[PDB]
């Protein structure tokens, strides 16, 4: 079936996009940590 | 059906966008980490 090949296909893509979103959200949290470290260091070193 | 034909390329188009965005974001994150390494040297 072509209909089944397209849906298996959609499910895979949706899953991968959701995984990317989770990954990127975690990166954003990590980035906030990096930015805080940079700010602290910049005032420490002047 | 055609609602899923649309849903499919919508999903695949978005996926390719994630790949492009990710490599851009990784250059950005490496830059922040490099800046921290430099600041720690002081």
């Amino acid at each position: 079936n072509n209909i089944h090949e397209m849906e298996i296909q959609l499910k895979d893509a949706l899953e991968k996009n959701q995984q990317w979103l989770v990954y990127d959200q975690q990166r954003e949290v990590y980035v906030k940590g990096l930015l805080a470290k940079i700010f602290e260091l910049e005032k420490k070193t002047e | 059906i055609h609602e899923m034909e649309i849903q499919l390329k919508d999903a695949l188009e978005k996926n390719q966008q994630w790949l492009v965005y990710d490599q851009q974001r990784e250059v950005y994150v490496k830059g922040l980490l490099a800046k921290i390494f430099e600041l720690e040297k002081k």
């Binding site: 995984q19 990954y23 990166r27 990590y30 | -």
Partner: peptide, 13 residues
């Protein structure tokens, strides 16, 4: 053709 992230969790999270 569709690809997911390098890891399921972002390194450092």
């Amino acid at each position: 053709q569709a690809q997911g992230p390098p890891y399921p969790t972002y390194p450092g999270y």
